[PDB]
Design a binder for this molecule. Structure first.
Ligand SMILES: [Cl-]
Ligand SMILES: [Cl-]
Length: 177
């Protein structure tokens, strides 16, 4: 199914490409042809056309293809530089987290998890679902995006609904829930 195959591509492209004989470039890209061969190690009926279709109809925009290269657009557990086009338009963004993080955040702003990017959402609902990954007691931080831009931070369009930024100073957090 597209769900199973996409789950496997997400794992390969974000977390364990070398286990499959793939070597991503600095931007997280691998050969889509080698990705097909890798995926076929698990799902032998997968075609390059199928993976291109998964990318095209992925509801979150998780993936990006350029010529023969394919990457996950965000969520990597290894070093990548992501030169996504800038979100210049959003005025308020959202960050899902858990209540016990508030103390730390109120001290030092939102810092990345070594990832070098903080994940924000354009929608409260998706920020909430994202925060639910780290526990049940979820709070959603309202983020002033103009405040971020004024301080010099560039907000990038990582996915259809995901936005990434280097850091969120306390000053730019305007509300909770
Ligand atoms: Cl393997
Ligand atoms: Cl990321």
């Amino acid at each position: 199914s597209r769900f199973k195959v996409s789950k496997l591509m997400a794992y390969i492209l974000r977390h364990s490409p070398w286990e499959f004989g793939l070597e991503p470039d600095e931007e997280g890209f691998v050969s889509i042809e080698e990705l097909v061969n890798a995926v076929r190690k698990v799902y032998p009926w997968v075609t390059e056309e199928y993976i291109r279709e998964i990318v095209e109809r992925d509801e979150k925009g998780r993936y990006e293809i350029r010529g023969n290269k394919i990457r996950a657009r965000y969520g990597h557990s290894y070093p990548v530089i992501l030169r996504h086009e800038e979100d210049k338009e959003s005025k308020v963004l959202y960050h899902g987290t858990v209540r016990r993080n508030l103390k730390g955040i109120m001290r030092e702003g939102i810092k990345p998890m070594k990832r070098q990017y903080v994940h924000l959402s354009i929608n409260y609902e998706d920020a909430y679902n994202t925060g639910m990954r780290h526990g049940e007691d979820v709070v959603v931080l309202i983020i002033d995006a103009e405040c971020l831009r004024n301080k010099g931070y560039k907000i990038l369009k990582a996915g259809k609904k995901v936005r990434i930024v280097k850091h969120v100073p306390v000053d730019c957090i305007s509300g909770i829930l």
